[PDB]
Amino acid sequence: KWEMERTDITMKHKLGEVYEGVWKKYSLTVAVKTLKEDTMEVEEFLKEAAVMKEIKHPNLVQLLGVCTREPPFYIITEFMTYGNLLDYLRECNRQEVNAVVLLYMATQISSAMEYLEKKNFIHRDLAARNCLVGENHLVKVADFGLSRLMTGDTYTAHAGAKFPIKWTAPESLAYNKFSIKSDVWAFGVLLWEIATYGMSPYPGIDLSQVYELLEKDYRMERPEGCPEKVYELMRACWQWNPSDRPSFAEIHQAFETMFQES
Numbered sequence: 001k002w003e004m005e006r007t008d009i010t011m012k013h014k015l016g017e018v019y020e021g022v023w024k025k026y027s028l029t030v031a032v033k034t035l036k037e038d039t040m041e042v043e044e045f046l047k048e049a050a051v052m053k054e055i056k057h058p059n060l061v062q063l064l065g066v067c068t069r070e071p072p073f074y075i076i077t078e079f080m081t082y083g084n085l086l087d088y089l090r091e092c093n094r095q096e097v098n099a100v101v102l103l104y105m106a107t108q109i110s111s112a113m114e115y116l117e118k119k120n121f122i123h124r125d126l127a128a129r130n131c132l133v134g135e136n137h138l139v140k141v142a143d144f145g146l147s148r149l150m151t152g153d154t155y156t157a158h159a160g161a162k163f164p165i166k167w168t169a170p171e172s173l174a175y176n177k178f179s180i181k182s183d184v185w186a187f188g189v190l191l192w193e194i195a196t197y198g199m200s201p202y203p204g205i206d207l208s209q210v211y212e213l214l215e216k217d218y219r220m221e222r223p224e225g226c227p228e229k230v231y232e233l234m235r236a237c238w239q240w241n242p243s244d245r246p247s248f249a250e251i252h253q254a255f256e257t258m259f260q261e262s
């Protein structure tokens with residue numbers, strides 16, 4: 001079990017809610033995602049925990065332990081000093097976080113998604129804000145709440161689900177069809193975030209025109225200095241028809257290559 005003792009953790013401050021914690025026993029800083037007793041995302045929070053137990057990879061935030069016997073409930077994970085990649089990128093000195101660094105981040109993230117692709121997982125919410133950073137530009141994928149292990153190739157969202165439109169693929173916006181491919185789309189947009197140091201996608205466009213524009217075959221222009229093969233991947237990631245999209249194995253491979261030629 002991952003079940004462990006509440007009392008071992010000195011709490012600290014805000015980051016259901018996330019808090020910086022200290023596992024007394026091992027002099028160690030941790031993140032603890034908590035749930036306030038009564039409020040019934042009890043279903044939905046235990047599901048996150050259950051998912052995290054099954055996954056393990058050096059580019060996925062690691063479940064260290066849990067308190068699910070007795071409320072207040074706790075998920076404990078490894079701590080990532082530099083927090084979310086979107087604010088990291090926006091706030092950073094780009095001489096240090098340079099062209100090649102960007103390529104490593106993209107490469108790490110692809111590594112973890114090929115892993116998820118092998119296990120048949122969708123993240124279903126892939127984005128700069130949901131990536132966390134450590135020392136020496138370590139990056140890991142986080143926030144596994146909407147992650148499912150699919151039976152079959154297709155998770156269908158409930159109608160009147162709310163999506164982050166500007167990261168969501170066309171078949172997901174029309175028919176609520178999610179899949180690995182729909183995360184490929186998501187990943188492509190994240191590349192666009194990384195390449196621009198955290199600009200918001202489809203800048204200046206209302207949510208209510210995005211789908212129509214994707215249908216009439218509009219895609220975000222290549223951002224300043226994005227490599228040619230990075231932009232090529234972004235564009236294959238944005239194929240209307242999901243069969244035409246690449247795979248995470250394909251993408252990672254291409255990044256592995258591109259990354260060593262640097």
Ligand SMILES: CN[C@@H]1C[C@H]2O[C@@](C)([C@@H]1OC)n1c3ccccc3c3c4c(c5c6c(n2c5c31)CCCC6)C(=O)NC4
Nearest residue numbers: 001002004023025026027028030056062063064065078
């Ligand atoms: C009851 N034991 C804990 C289980 C857990 O978290 C601890 C706090 C403890 O394990 C050493 N832990 C560490 C403490 C100090 C330095 C490194 C680690 C550490 C580490 C890991 C780890 C894991 C678990 N725990 C880990 C670790 C739970 C099961 C999956 C992996 C790990 O994978 N690398 C360092």
